[PDB]
Amino acid sequence: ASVYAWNRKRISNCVADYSVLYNSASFSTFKCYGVSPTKLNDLCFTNVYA
Amino acid sequence: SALGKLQDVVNQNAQALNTLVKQLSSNFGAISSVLNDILSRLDKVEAEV
């Protein structure tokens, strides 16, 4: 999406392996602000919004 | 109401202990006051801060 009309996808009813994201050669930054990316696989969330 | 001295000494200690327990729920600027939230969410170098 554009910046002004930025797009939200709600994510629900799944298992997600965040290591598959974090280890991806694609990403130039992966900064996190209250969870460390190594710890994501130990957690479960009431909602996730991308 | 005659025993106000002794019942106040009991109340002061109960209020002191309940204040000390309720202060476990205070953040003091941490991301959570529950110590297991920090240790489950954050890796060592961030968690220590």
Closest alpha carbon to A45 in A10, A1, A5: A10
Do B41 and A43 count as a contact with CB atoms less than 8 A apart?
yes
Tokens matching residue A42: 């130990």
Do A36 and B42 count as a contact with CB atoms less than 8 A apart?
yes
Instruction: Pinpoint the alpha helices (H) of A1-50.
Output: 18-22
Dihedral sign from CA coordinates of B24, B27, B29, B35: positive
Burial group, residue A46, by CB count within 10 angstroms (0-12, 13-18, 19+): exposed
Q: Is A9 left (phi over 0), alpha (psi -120 to 50) or beta?
A: beta
Do A8 and A48 form a contact (C-beta atoms < 8 A)? no
Nearest CA in chain B to A39: B41
C-alpha–C-alpha distance, residues B28 and B11, integer Å: 27
